[PDB]
Design a protein around this nucleic acid. Structure first.
Ligand code: ZN
Length: 178
RNA sequence: GUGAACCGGAGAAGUCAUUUAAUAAGGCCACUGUUAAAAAGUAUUCCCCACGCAUGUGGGG
């Protein structure tokens, strides 16, 4: 839904800096540099698995702190899907079918892999000629703002990530590289 | 005009206090430096230059 809060389109991209902090290694400014019609979907698909804790609005997502993600490789895309093809007993419920779908404590694969930790609404394209700040290809239309407001997951949810790694009690094993 | 361009790991700090290397020793016994010479009674003094050439005078290194 269209929440009244307005945020720049660069908040969904981690490598591109946003409000506060610094802007070195990526010389951009808010609301003047936008995203094309593919990088917006790139940012949208990154929501359920790489959502950071943040400041106020500590609730990150179904995995809290993002852990290591391990999966088996191949040499072709159709081949790549075969190694990691592990159907479960129940295929949960759709979470991208236009339904927010308040479920029970136990969740499923289709409702887990497509989580939406934040309400998101993208504004209409703006005419122009400039390129985006992620892939850099010149285009005709760009998106410059979005409506983002934080949402907390229900406490005590039961969900084991198929590609996650846990230490001893379900706590996420992150990367301790500084 | 190159995952590149633009870019300090920076500010600060007595290792100070105590201590004999001390007590002793013979380097001792043996050994010719010997055999040879005039600085002076010579027969060409190692080199240059003036003169007329009866084992000639003068001058300089
Ligand atoms: Zn792009």
């Amino acid at each position: 839904d269209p929440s009244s809060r307005i945020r720049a389109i660069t908040d969904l991209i981690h490598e591109i800096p946003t409000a506060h902090n610094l802007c070195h290694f990526k010389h951009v400014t808010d609301y003047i540099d936008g995203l094309c019609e593919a990088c917006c979907i790139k940012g949208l698909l990154r929501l359920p698995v790489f959502t950071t804790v943040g400041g106020r609005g500590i609730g990150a997502g179904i995995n809290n702190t993002p852990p290591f993600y391990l999966l088996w490789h191949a040499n072709d895309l159709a081949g790549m899907l075969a190694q990691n093809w592990q159907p479960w007993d129940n295929m949960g419920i759709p979470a991208w079918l236009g339904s927010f779908q308040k479920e029970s404590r136990e969740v499923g694969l289709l409702a887990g892999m497509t989580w939406l930790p934040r309400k998101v609404y993208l504004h209409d394209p703006v005419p122009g000629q400039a390129a985006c700040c992620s892939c850099g290809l010149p285009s005709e239309a760009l998106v410059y703002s979005c409506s983002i407001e934080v949402e907390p997951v229900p406490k005590g949810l039961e969900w084991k990530d198929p590609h996650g790694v846990y230490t001893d009690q379900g706590k996420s094993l992150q990367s301790k590289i500084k």
